[PDB]
């Protein structure tokens, strides 16, 4: 019923082979819409969704100058880290940030996100009360007391309750017909063969959006729970997604096993079987 | 849109 907006940062020191690289990507739901990369050759926020292309040039200046600013800010932050952790200069490290907001279905705030991470480890986190922080290690505590006294808390909250949800509602309406229109997965079940006194069925989910989906699937049943075999929800490439459950069952059983196929695109949710 | 503080730093 709801929606989300998430910007992601990736700062990556790399010494000898550069000054550090800084990348920013912006999603709405599972739709990538804005990209920034300080490599550039002449850098600026670039439009990757069609509904964002239709914006003022003054929108793009704001957004570039933000990430151009953040280029330097993080090159600093990567080095302030080295001091906190006493780390060698030759080492290559990574800072990762994610911030954003959830709406949803009426059109308010639900919760806020603002989360930083160092070398793939939780560093600092903005709590769900949007006024206090979580310090992971003794190094983050520096960087907490910095923001505590600088009253950084409120300027997020003001933004996350304001411009975050404001802009999101704008993005949604502007590209409603791709973003607010869930697509059902085209489902089928294939036979594989096997053993022969033992088979593998395979419940296919294809060509759907968003990535959220559940495939897991029966006999009487529950079932399975456990066999399984589930596979990582992979991207098709056309802004649609894919997935299967197996499973492995005895041969000639066999129409016992029923599949099971929850998506927000559907009403039902469906129930499939081997056909043939 | 994005939000830049700016003085938020490690």
């Amino acid at each position, epitope marked *: 019923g709801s929606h989300s907006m998430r910007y992601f940062y990736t700062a990556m020191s790399r010494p000898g082979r550069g000054e550090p690289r800084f990348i920013t990507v912006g999603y709405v739901d599972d739709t990538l819409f804005v990209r920034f990369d300080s490599d550039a050759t002449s850098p600026r926020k670039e439009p990757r969704a069609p509904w964002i292309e239709q914006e003022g040039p003054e929108y793009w200046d704001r957004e570039t100058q933000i990430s*151009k600013t953040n*280029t330097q800010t993080y*090159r*600093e932050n990567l080095r302030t880290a080295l001091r906190y952790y006493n780390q060698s200069e030759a080492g290559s490290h990574i800072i990762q940030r994610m911030y954003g907001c959830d709406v949803g279905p009426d059109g308010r705030l639900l919760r806020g996100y603002d989360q930083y991470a160092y070398d793939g480890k939780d560093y600092i986190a903005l709590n769900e009360d949007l006024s206090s922080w979580t310090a992971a290690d003794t190094a983050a505590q520096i960087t907490q007391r*910095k923001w505590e006294a600088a*009253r950084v808390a409120e300027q997020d909250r*003001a933004y996350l309750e*304001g411009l975050c949800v*404001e802009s999101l509602r704008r993005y949604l309406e502007n590209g409603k017909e791709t973003l607010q229109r869930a697509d059902p997965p085209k489902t089928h079940v294939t036979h594989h063969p096997i053993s022969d006194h033992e088979v593998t069925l395979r419940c296919w989910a294809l060509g759907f959006y968003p990535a959220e989906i559940t495939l897991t699937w029966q006999r009487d049943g529950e079932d399975q729970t456990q066999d399984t075999e589930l596979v990582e929800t992979r991207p098709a490439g056309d802004r649609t997604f894919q997935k299967w459950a197996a499973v492995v069952v005895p041969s000639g059983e066999e129409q016992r096993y029923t599949c099971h196929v929850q998506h927000e695109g559907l009403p039902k949710p469906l129930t499939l079987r081997w056909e043939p | 849109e994005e939000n830049l503080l700016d*003085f938020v730093r490690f």
Partner: T-cell receptor, first 115, second 108 residues
């Protein structure tokens, strides 16, 4: 009094060159340039972070060129001086935290271009 | 624009003194900032904040808290305080746009 500038004043004929300078407090991250005609507030010119020129307004003619190579001092150069360039050229800086937006200004180079 | 101030303005040493500003859009992630330029030099900072309340050595600052029309107090006004005052909105990262602004005269 942190920020210092060179020189305090300058005077020149028309189609002439002239370059100013701003030495901010070391360990100041950001450095700003402003111009101020007597009567108005300071108008924004350019803004540097470390050694990079992040923003610059349409007030910057091509004739103007700010530069900050080592990310310490900054040189502001005017190519073909006009009578309209005549103004106070201020230069402020900010500490490298800070927190808040506390800009520390200098004495200002005083340009007066004459016929 | 964003930043209507009285072009000038008197006061008496020393109560008041009571130095308004109208910022009648400002969305809520934008700070309200006040600077002062004492004639011969060349601005300093005085106070922000945020959308709040708030109150330091130079300066109090009362926001509407509906965000609407802030007021610098300068609490016991003196001759030294006579200067040009600028009321500017900062949204983070952007450039500052000093207005015109308010010239306060304090007379004994």
């Amino acid at each position: 009094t942190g920020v210092s500038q060179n020189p305090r004043h300058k005077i020149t004929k028309r189609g002439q060159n002239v370059t100013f300078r701003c030495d901010p407090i070391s360990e100041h991250n950001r450095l700003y340039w402003y111009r101020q005609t007597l009567g108005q507030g300071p108008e924004f010119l350019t803004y540097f972070q470390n050694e990079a020129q992040l923003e610059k307004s349409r007030l910057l003619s091509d004739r103007f060129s700010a530069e900050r190579p080592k990310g310490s001092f900054s040189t502001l150069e005017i190519q073909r001086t006009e009578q309209g360039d005549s103004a106070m050229y201020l230069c402020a800086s900010r500490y490298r935290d800070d927190s808040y937006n506390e800009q520390f200004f200098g004495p200002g180079t005083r340009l007066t271009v004459l016929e | 624009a964003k930043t209507t101030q009285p072009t000038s303005m008197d006061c008496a040493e020393g109560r008041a003194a009571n130095l308004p500003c109208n910022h009648s859009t400002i969305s809520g992630n934008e700070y309200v900032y006040w600077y002062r330029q004492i004639h011969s030099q060349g601005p300093q900072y005085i106070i922000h904040g945020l959308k709040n309340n708030e109150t330091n050595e130079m300066a109090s600052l009362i926001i509407t808290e509906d965000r609407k029309s802030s007021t610098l107090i300068l609490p016991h006004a003196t001759l030294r305080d006579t200067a040009v005052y600028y009321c500017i909105v900062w949204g983070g990262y952007q450039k500052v746009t000093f207005g015109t602004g308010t010239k306060l005269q304090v007379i004994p």
